[PDB]
Design a protein around this nucleic acid. Structure first.
Ligand SMILES: Nc1ncnc2c1ncn2[C@@H]1O[C@H](CSCC[C@H](N)C(=O)O)[C@@H](O)[C@H]1O
Length: 327
DNA sequence: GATAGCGCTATC
DNA sequence: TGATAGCGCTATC
């Protein structure tokens, strides 16, 4: 994550729904905002959350009375995406884990925050011929909020990861906000290898399969893109080796393959998956962040989390707009 | 809970 | 296309 000297969000209080690791909290807190409520039902995520913020999020949101939610200016939510990802069986709202957005809708209806900050996967914008995004636009417009939506790639904001996500920002109409903009991308000067840990600490992650087929030459010069070098087995998800000289592929939460949830990388002549901490760095988390003791769970948590840096630039721009109030 | 083969989708 | 990539799915122990 980045350091922020002008706390555009000072004095403002927010809600951390579908918290997970608390990526949103880190981002809004670095801008001066105050977290007044957090919600996350996964036992393990809850443990990491406490392990890093002292508190334990509330259980199943679908069964929490919105009236209960503390007043807040900004509502943060990176709701479930298994139901909309390019990787899943796109059952959208028909999927049990696909209706959570409507829970946000009722939270908003009751609490009417000044801003609604949401995030989901890219395939979300086009899912079901775009009808899914439309339901969210109209549902938000019908609650009387503007709807600013856009897809950004982390590689465009200082983090070497091809993670492309859609960010939805909603302001309450009454407060006429018309200068809000998404962060302009800027050159990527950081690559996978710049974030790796010393070999002595990742020896155990080294994999060595006889079906390893290097199909491409290691790259000398760095690029702001993922560059496949080889493959293992059939080369499906988690069976592809990439260059640490390029950027990292999208981390996943339920992903499989020998290099499950992180992908394979070629480091000093060896083939291995990323270390939970390297994942953290890939997601923009400060090394001071305590990861969960269970690696499988840690990989999962970082897998469906958010890139703090990106979240920061948006959060900063949310404050810039909220603060511009001339006479 | 942890591990890992997959198998289909979207993009251009 | 043909090649690449995905907050995934789920069977097994
Ligand atoms: N009904 C429900 N109540 C609370 N959390 C839920 C939920 N259904 C799904 N979730 C949680 O939704 C989260 C989606 S992942 C969101 C990650 C988050 N922005 C971060 O930075 O970590 C998961 O952690 C999942 O456990």
């Amino acid at each position: 994550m980045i350091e922020i000297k002008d706390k555009q969000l000072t004095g403002l209080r927010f809600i951390d729904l579908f918290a997970g690791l608390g990526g949103f909290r880190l981002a809004l807190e670095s801008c001066g905002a105050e977290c007044v409520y957090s919600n996350e039902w996964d036992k393990y995520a809850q443990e990491v959350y406490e392990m890093n913020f002292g508190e334990k999020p509330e259980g199943d949101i679908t069964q929490v009375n919105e009236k209960t939610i503390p007043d807040h200016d900004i509502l943060c939510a990176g709701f479930p995406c298994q139901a909309f990802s390019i990787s899943g069986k796109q059952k959208g709202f028909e999927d049990s884990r696909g209706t959570l957005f409507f829970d946000i809708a009722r939270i908003v209806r009751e609490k009417k925050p000044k801003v609604v900050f949401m995030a989901n996967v890219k395939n979300f914008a086009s899912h079901d011929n775009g009808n899914t995004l439309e339901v969210v636009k109209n549902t938000m417009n019908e609650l009387d909020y503007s709807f600013h939506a856009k897809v950004l790639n982390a590689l465009d904001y200082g983090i070497p990861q091809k993670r492309e996500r859609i960010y939805m920002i909603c302001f309450r109409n009454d407060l006429n906000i018309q200068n809000f903009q998404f962060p302009k991308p800027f050159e990527l000067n950081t690559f996978v290898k710049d974030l790796l840990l010393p070999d002595s600490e990742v020896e155990h992650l080294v994999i060595d399969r006889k079906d390893l087929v290097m199909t491409n030459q290691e790259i000398e010069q760095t690029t702001p893109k993922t560059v496949r070098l080889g493959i293992v087995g059939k080369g499906g998800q988690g069976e592809r080796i990439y260059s640490t000289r390029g950027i990292a592929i999208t981390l996943s939460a339920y992903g499989g393959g020998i290099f499950a949830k992180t992908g394979g990388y070629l480091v000093n002549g060896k083939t291995r998956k990323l270390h939970p901490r390297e994942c953290a760095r890939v997601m923009g988390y400060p090394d001071s962040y305590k990861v969960h003791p269970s690696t499988s769970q840690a990989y999962k948590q970082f897998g469906n989390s958010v890139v703090i840096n990106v979240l920061q630039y948006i959060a900063y721009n949310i404050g810039s707009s909220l603060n511009f109030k001339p006479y």
